[PDB]
């Protein structure tokens, strides 16, 4: 059914009190972190933890801006989760579940384990009623001017169901 999902406590997330996300979301936006990648769970948690602190301390967000992140370890990491507002895409933080692949994917795409985990996640969101059945899937760059989720990754998701052409 739903992939495992590594929680904030596991990667030692800082505590916050951020605005709630009203479910179900109408869109899914694919993003890459554009930073280092990670193929083992402990390396990925550290990466997630630093991102939360980067977003909070330098970008001044309320928390990590993603709802979830996916690692080349085939792991799905909880960003703010399903119930919190996001801080990933201008104008879509309250209606779009932001999912970031941990890594930089313009030249090379996430591995099979990552791509697979991402999809199982999306599937779960619909099944569970967190996403509308008719939801739209888009690339970060289709929405705003930004270098994400990277061409190689873009080419893959564009073949996904619901991808908005």
């Amino acid at each position: 059914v739903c992939p495992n999902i590594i929680k904030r406590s596991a990667w030692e997330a800082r505590e916050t009190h951020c605005p709630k996300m009203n479910l179900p979301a109408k869109y899914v936006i694919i993003i890459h972190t554009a930073g280092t990648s990670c193929t083992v769970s402990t390396d990925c948690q550290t990466v997630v933890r630093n991102i939360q602190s980067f977003h909070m301390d330098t970008r001044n967000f309320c928390d990590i801006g993603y709802h979830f992140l996916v690692g080349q370890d085939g792991g799905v990491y909880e960003g703010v989760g399903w119930h919190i507002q996001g801080s990933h895409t201008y104008g879509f933080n309250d209606i779009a579940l932001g999912i970031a692949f941990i890594g930089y994917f313009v030249e090379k795409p996430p591995n099979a384990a990552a791509l697979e985990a991402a999809q199982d996640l999306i599937q779960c969101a619909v099944v569970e009623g967190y996403l509308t059945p008719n939801y739209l899937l888009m690339g970060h760059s289709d929405v705003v001017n930004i270098l994400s989720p990277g061409q190689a990754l873009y080419n893959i998701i564009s073949t996904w169901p619901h991808f908005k052409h």
Partner: peptide, 5 residues
């Protein structure tokens, strides 16, 4: 990442 908007 792009808060608010």
């Amino acid at each position: 990442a792009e808060k608010x908007x």
